[model samples]
Target chain A: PKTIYIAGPAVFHPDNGEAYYNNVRALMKGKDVVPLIPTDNIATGAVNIRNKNIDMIRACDAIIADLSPFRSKEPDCGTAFELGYAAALGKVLLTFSTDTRPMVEKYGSEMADGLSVENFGLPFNLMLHDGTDVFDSFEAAFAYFVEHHL
Target chain B: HMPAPKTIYIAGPAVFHPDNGEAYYNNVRALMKGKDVVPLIPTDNIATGAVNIRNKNIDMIRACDAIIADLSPFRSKEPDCGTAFELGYAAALGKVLLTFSTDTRPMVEKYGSEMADGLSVENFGLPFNLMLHDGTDVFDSFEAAFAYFVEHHLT
Candidate 1:
């Protein structure tokens, strides 16, 4: 139906900014899904950038969050806050982490139970193996929506 | 004519024990020492078949002047992280937040820097205060946390 916003850590050393964005775009190719990139400009101050991202979340339909560690120096506070906000909204949340750490190991306070995390590679690993079945890629998520809608 | 004492709502997974939950609620009532206190045990009846307990918990938080959150890990793979979420809700509403974690600091440290940092920033960094308890000598620490709330928030 609408777009899915992918929220996660960006602006870190050895940044995979382009690859991450492109992967998400490739996943949702055939469907009517758009991606909301939180880190559009890294040059802006952290506070300003974070506020803008929060505003974007308030206006989105669903959220696909990457809970992996970012920057390697600072904690991923932005992702955590975004996830909290999305959870408060009761949005259909789809979360995945490339990191090998388990959800329990990654977030200690037992808050990551609802979201799905795939340690292995993308696409098949999360949906097929984990049984999320929502969206294999952006394409699959959108296709399902189109079929269900019209 | 003095106004009724402000109510303090406690939310967490305390329903695993029928006797213990009632006793805990009673302790909170007694500790209020005649002050108005509302104990909202999410575990008692709501845990069985509530569609959206998270929203219900948020409502309870918004309805109270203060909160006492129990951060004890009850079951594995359970998505009910109400303690942390309720604490955040209380902080957002500008309510007094008095949190006590039965888990140790070292145990929390093992969870990862993300969780540790999030808890510190969201819970400890808020203008409302939180205290850590190790589940031992529970009633006294709970009393102390509530007393701190009375001193600062109760006027």
Candidate 2:
């Protein structure tokens, strides 16, 4: 079964991690795919989680990133970083944003002391989007995942 | 000639915070004080009228020799995405990276409000993503991280 190295902000779920994993798994139910949850790998006693997570990513054929906002008005930095790593590796990149509003709408009133926000009408930064497929909801990405991945 | 004090490109979600990011950069500035290093805090900050902010940030990274990132949980359980980009950018450029988090628990332990969701945090032993922390020594406290800065760059 081909593996999908999962990347996103789900690790911070209020349920710790149950919700997203369960959701994604069910979405992939009946498909011959294994989800490599980076957070799950952390608990597997991997001596070094960082490189090993990339190792997981390195061994996979594609990447599915949760482009949802983590804290500020953008996607999770860690997710963005993983996207870059996978992009460099030429992995298939698919992303989903829980928030559907333009990034500028989420941060229009946030200007302060020369601090600014990305107003590109994108769900996230444009640099992180180029050449990658983006979805507004998991259901959409999941549909694509089942069709393309399997 | 020993090049002038190396510039530390600051990265994190502090700039987008409630206080205009002043306190954040100042806090970091206070740490690097009396040391032989300069902190080019992007959020400290620069006006955005005509200059392309994104390119400006990329240029700033090009000028700096190192980066110190705050890997602490931000608005959510994750660090700021922009900061992550800088970390990756700096890493690609071969700049030295050093990170810290005020909350010392493993990142796996730093999840949303629920207590012990039965699922375990990543066992990598470090909080946050591996790429973000790999090769970067993570300091549990600002003082310790700063102390490392002084030791590594000042002396």
Candidate 3:
């Protein structure tokens, strides 16, 4: 079975934690996919989880990332780093958002453009989410992913 | 009653570079002229991960009254698109939005249209179109954009 490693901001986000994780889990149903939650253990700040996550990424065939800004007060930088690392490794990476505001619009062009460039390696399908569902709700994204992946 | 000059906030990838810095800084300074122009660039601290760039971007959106983005090369890969994001964020915050792309490369037309309600400026076109008026001749050149502000005493 092919394994898909999921990297995103789940450990820290309060509102959409379970929903985002479960959505991906449902999408990868029956596939040998495992959700690797990356987080630094607070007491140690050992970064063990991050290291482990990278190792798992190396072990997996692809990655699905939730690239939403967690909130106005605090965001998950670890998620961005994880995605960047995955991109560098040439992993088959896919990112989506559930926020009403698009990433480019909310963050400004600099960050948004960086994400696009990092995600799309070649100019052919250079923009992220080519005909893939990037929606405002988890259900929509899950449905799209399931339909496409399965 | 006379309305106040709109406070336009600028964001983009070029803000990161030392060379591009002067162009963006001067462009906004010219565009705003006499109006309140808030220029927000990702700090070196943020690039080094010392601070959260995302949060700073959000703060800039909340603080500004309007937005003008320089969709120029922010990085070697794609610069215009980054400015598009800043424009989108400003739109989400209900601030007036405007954008321009220098002739470094063809602009990402779809990305701009999908993200913002109005169209974006490509090549040597107007700067304030997304906010001012549909087909309103806001500017003809960078000099004109600056001159309009100066003539109006916008800031």
Candidate 4:
């Protein structure tokens, strides 16, 4: 099983993600893949957490992300950031958006270029999603994992 | 006091303008006028090639001492993905990260709940996720952020 770094806003859960982490793992159940949750891989006593987190992503065989909007209409900033890091490393990017609405329908009301101009209605920006394989839900995404990755 | 870094990487979706928004980058450069900090924007070369961008951005970020990113909410709930990537790269390198947003809320309030029509807001204390803001100073306005940018990076 290839190790996968799971990226999302789930770590911000107030409960310290006791259940969130379990659910993320469950999302990959029986896939024979190990999911590395950022919250779980802390460099434990490391002063600079930035190094610790980047280390986790670098160690992974690939990355799976939840690009769902967390606070704003966009995906979690850190997740977006992590996704890019994984991209720079040439890691396979697999993502799922639980809220599958076209971005225009979701956030087009804004004074953004999307509403007035080039709008693919993708859940996120093209630079992040252009080359990667995307899915509407984690179950669907995990299927790909079991097939190609696992 | 800590000596301010010399060059700053301006990161965000500013490069996505219809004309690729040369004016936006120019305005940013104007803002840094005589600040003693060089502002490096990727779009200045967006016209160069469709291929060399990723490498250029990566290289420029590597050469910068800090970053000033626009965290303003884009299309839906997130900042520009490319900008987010640059932030991560700079953060990984421990660059001085500064962010400014057009919206002034606790991030949890950005949803329509802050709007009479919006509801069910989140509860992250910081504007962005805890991890994204390790060393970032969130400013409500670019003017305020830039003021500090000068104080810290210039005389």
lDDT of model 1, residue A80: 42
Which candidate leads in TM-score? 4
Report clash pairs, candidate 1. Answer: A27-A138, A27-A139, A28-A138, A28-A139
Best by DockQ: 4
Ranking by DockQ: 4, 2, 1, 3
For model 1, how does the per-residue alpha-carbon lDDT over A1-150 read when each residue is reduced to its tens digit? 575667655423234356767777787676666677774364254445545565666677877755444433112434544555565555556555445444445545333334332223332111111234434343454455455543
Evaluation by DockQ, superior candidate among 1 and 4: 4
For all predictions, the C-alpha RMSD in Å is 9.8, 5.8, 17.4, 5.7
lDDT of 3 at A147: 58
Clashing pairs in 2: A42-B122, A42-B123, A43-B122, A43-B123, A50-B130, A77-B81, B107-B127
Q: Can you tell me the CAPRI class of model 4?
A: acceptable
Candidate 4 residues A1-150, lDDT tens each? 778888876655555456767877887677667888785335442234555677889898888888887655667767878887787677888898878776667755534644332245556655456445569866677678778865
Q: In candidate 4, which residue ranges exceed 4 Å CA deviation?
A: A10-24, A27-32, A38-55, A69-73, A88-90, A98-123, A146-150, B1-5, B15-23, B44-56, B75-78, B108-124, B153-155
Q: What ranges in model 3 sit over 4 Å off? A: A14-32, A39-44, A73-75, A100-150, B1-19, B22-155
Question: For the second chain of model 4, what is the TM-score against the true structure's chain B?
Answer: 0.80
Instruction: Give one digit per residue, the lDDT tens place, for model 4 in B1-155.
Output: 32554888888776656556578777777887865677777743453532346667777888988788887776656566668877877776768888877865665665544322232333444554445566556887656776787887665
The per-model lDDT (C-alpha) reads 0.49, 0.68, 0.44, 0.68
Give the per-residue lDDT digits (tens) of candidate 2, residues A1-150.
Answer: 888888886776666567878887887667787788884435444345566676777788878888886555568776788776676566777888878676668766435334456555666665466544578777787678778766
Residue B77 CA error for candidate 1 (Å)?
13
TM value for model 4? 0.69
